[PDB]
RNA sequence: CUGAUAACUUCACGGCGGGCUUGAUGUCCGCGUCUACCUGGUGAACUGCCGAGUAGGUAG
């Protein structure tokens, strides 16, 4: 069990999202930003308190009303621009069929046989819709879909005989899961993700394009660097610096599918221990036995059962097959 | 109380302001200034022969006050969720929504550019909306008190649609705002100023290729938020902060020796569930508590 | 997980849910490029006929 | 009030000859940094005149 060397690699391969400004002349230009210094008040609680006590004659009414300088990076839409566009690419492959490094051919035959049986008994129709209902919905813009007039998505699949698949205004049209199903090209896209999870050289590639309608001089919020001041990540598009929203963050929106944890309310980022980032309580803890390492050690158990209850058996096969699509490092001594 | 990681996100989203110069022949150009010289001093004025001056920004009323952004604890979670949900019933969003809207309506966001003006008019453009452009004409001599607004044809719908934007989860309300200022000939315009930690350097942007001043996006967020007159013996409305800081004089009201700052009311959250399950001061400090959750900020020690 | 089981009870609920900062190199094809062009050289000779 | 008192170590000098470190090599697998911000010119250096003049001059 967990034979001290075992690793997979990822099946989903996104990129980073470069923003563009379109004008009413239809000509495109890259969005930019500048650094701005500002002045705020003295908000922090430790400046005028401590554990049960105000500081000793240092919290004076003249010194809590001083000027505090900060500095931010500030980005917004220029005046007169028509709308905003976004553009990345994502590709799905077949990497979960077989481990990358394995070290033991007795846990290898347990895992390869477990993926052949999953394709047959309870197939790829549940996982393929959930990754695709975050690409064709706009989870990957993350906060720019609040305070918007309208946004659209048009994607260019490969290989494909036909047209581009469009999705018009997503706040009333494409809301439920049944709304996506009535589209003209929905059964042909999910018969292209099921293939790529089932071949041995399976490959489906999508070129995803979006528009955004925001108010006048409205703000755009990309991702930030870590600083081992609100510094933005940026690349160089045609000589101009420009914010990018990152590539490890657009792959975390697509993998926001997990709602099988034992009392669900919203989808989480798929992980080994089930962390949740707003409130720092970690659901799917290793005490309850519902995390990844516990239910992987019943791999021989779940083979024989489906050779079926959608209460604990099928809900654990979805979590176990989704961590193998994420990839990683599954071992200890 | 205050378990070391708590933060809210703001619920009012103003943008920069832009100054355009309209000619008599219905042509609009950007208002450009002059620089004079390390030591650098700027000068801005209305160009001769111009009719008036236009201004346009936008603001949004969203619903990020229902739950926090990071919370760290499920005892400060369901307490602060219940306070905003009980304030919706017993008090209502009426007394806050009217105060935020009037500072948008009566040109308060034009700081010192209304002094020595003949007439100015302000036109809203709400969304989602079935109807007409909303007008407020000759504001100095027609709209001066809470009651002149309440006689308007379109005040029952714009106090509304903000009340729903705080009450309903995933709510939204967006206002486009336009103003026209009839200033005298060769009149001075007063934009915002760059900090320059130690003069009068303007905050500029590029509109149609040539530079133009902005009057800031944090500057126009301060003007809408001046609704605070519940500090004791209040004579003038202040900007909503944690310690009631006044800017012109460098004192501050609301000091923790008084017992009326935010951190000595936020700790008393369980006390106020009992009375709301009282119209003297238990109401008049929840207007300060609600205006801090609409503001945002990290609340942690 | 300590050795084989019985998890080490210092990694509590919120202890697992912090970050883990790292640093990697990153290479990508820039926006608006056409294609990526590779080149090397290889040579064959007779070095096996005698030691 | 000194193991006390006094004290010239000097002249001359060729290290040299010769020299192949070599053969072979896959560092890899996974990754959300984020929340909140006022810089404060009161009225203040005003009005003519010549010249075609966004140049130039000239008044109290």
Alpha-carbon distance of B269 to B296, in angstroms, equals: 17
Nearest CA-CA partner of C32 in A157, A90, A236: A236
**Interrupted backbone of chain C, residues before each interruption (C–N > 2.5 Å):** none
- Sign for the CA dihedral angle at A190, A193, A198, A204 comes to positive
Answer whether A282 sits within 8 Å of C1, measured CB to CB. no
Is the bond preceding B47 in cis, omega lying within 30 degrees of 0?
no
Alpha-carbon distance of B138 to B121, in angstroms, equals: 5
Answer whether B256 sits within 8 Å of A48, measured CB to CB. yes
Please answer whether residues A237 and A289 qualify as being in contact, where contact means their C-beta atoms are separated by less than 8 angstroms.
no
Q: Which two tokens stand for residue B74?
A: 């499920």
**Interrupted backbone of chain B, residues before each interruption (C–N > 2.5 Å):** 37, 198, 277
Q: How far is A311 from chain C (nearest CA, A)?
A: 25
Any B CB within 8 A of A54 CB = yes
* Declared resolution, Å: 3.2
Q: How far is B20 from chain A (nearest CA, A)?
A: 12
Please answer whether residues C32 and A238 qualify as being in contact, where contact means their C-beta atoms are separated by less than 8 angstroms.
yes
Q: What angle do CA A85, A91, A97 make, to 5 degrees?
A: 160
Answer whether C1 sits within 8 Å of A228, measured CB to CB. no
Any B CB within 8 A of A282 CB = no
Residue B227 CA and nucleotide D42 C1' are separated, in Å, by 25
Any B CB within 8 A of A310 CB = no
CA distances to A59, B260, B262, B263, B281 from B256, in Å: 9, 6, 9, 8, 17
Residue B296 CA and nucleotide D40 C1' are separated, in Å, by 25
Any C CB within 8 A of A85 CB = no
Q: What angle do CA A79, A82, A83 make, to 5 degrees?
A: 105
> Looking at the partner chain, which of B70, B241, B246 has a beta carbon nearest the beta carbon of A43?
B241
CA distances to A31, A46, A259, B261 from A74, in Å: 12, 28, 36, 31
Q: How many CB atoms lie within 10 A of CB B251?
A: 15
Of all nucleotides, the one whose C1′ comes closest to residue C22's CA is D31
Method: cryo-EM
In A26-160 the beta strands, taken as DSSP E runs, fall at: 28-30, 34-40, 68-74, 83-93, 150-158
Any B CB within 8 A of A46 CB = yes
Residue A218 CA and nucleotide D30 C1' are separated, in Å, by 36
> Looking at the partner chain, which of B18, B195, B246 has a beta carbon nearest the beta carbon of A38?
B195
Please answer whether residues A35 and A70 qualify as being in contact, where contact means their C-beta atoms are separated by less than 8 angstroms.
no
Answer whether A286 sits within 8 Å of C1, measured CB to CB. yes
CB contacts under 8 A, B 193-222 vs A, are 194-197, 203, 206-208, 217-218
How would you class A222 by CB atoms within 10 Å of its CB: exposed for 0-12, middle for 13-18, buried for 19 or more? Answer: buried
List, in order, residues 6 or more apart from B206 with CB less than 8 Å away: A78, B212
Q: Which residue has the tokens 């090209």?
A: A185
Residue nearest to nucleotide D32 (CA to C1'): A249
Q: How many CB atoms lie within 10 A of CB A179?
A: 15
């Amino acid at each position: 069990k967990l034979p001290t060397n075992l690793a997979y690699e990822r099946s989903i391969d996104p990129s980073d999202v470069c923003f563009f400004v379109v004008w009413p002349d239809d000509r495109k230009t890259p969005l930019t930003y500048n650094s701005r210094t500002l002045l705020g008040q003295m908000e922090a609680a430790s400046l005028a308190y401590d554990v049960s006590g105000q500081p000793i004659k240092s919290a004076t009414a003249e010194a809590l009303a001083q000027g505090n300088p900060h500095q931010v990076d500030f980005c917004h839409v220029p005046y007169g621009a028509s709308h905003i566009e976004c553009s990345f690419s994502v590709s799905f492959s077949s990497e979960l069929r077989q481990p990358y490094k394995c070290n033991s051919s007795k846990v290898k035959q347990t895992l390869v046989q477990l993926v052949e049986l999953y394709e047959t008994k309870i197939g790829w129709t549940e996982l393929a819709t959930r990754y695709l209902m975050n690409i064709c919905n706009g989870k990957w813009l993350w906060k720019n879909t609040r305070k918007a007039y309208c946004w659209n998505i048009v994607l260019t699949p490969w290989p494909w005989n036909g047209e581009k698949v469009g999705f018009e205004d997503i706040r009333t049209n494409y809301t439920s899961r049944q709304d996506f199903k009535n589209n003209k090209n929905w059964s042909a896209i999910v018969e292209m993700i099921k293939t790529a999870f089932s071949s041995t050289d399976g490959l489906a590639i999508f070129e995803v394009r979006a528009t955004l309608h925001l108010p006048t001089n409205a703000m755009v919020r990309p991702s930030q660097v870590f600083t081992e001041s609100r510094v933005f990540q940026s690349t160089t598009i045609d000589g101009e610096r420009s914010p990018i929203l990152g590539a490890f963050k657009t792959g975390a929106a697509i993998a926001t599918i997990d709602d099988w944890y034992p009392e669900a309310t919203e989808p989480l980022r798929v992980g080994r221990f089930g962390v949740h980032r707003e409130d720092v309580t970690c659901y799917r803890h290793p005490s309850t036995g519902k995390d990844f390492f516990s239910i992987l050690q019943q791999a021989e158990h779940y083979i024989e059962v489906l050779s079926t209850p959608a209460q604990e058996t099928i809900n654990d096969m979805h979590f176990l097959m989704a961590n193998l699509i994420k990839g990683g490092m599954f071992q200890h001594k």
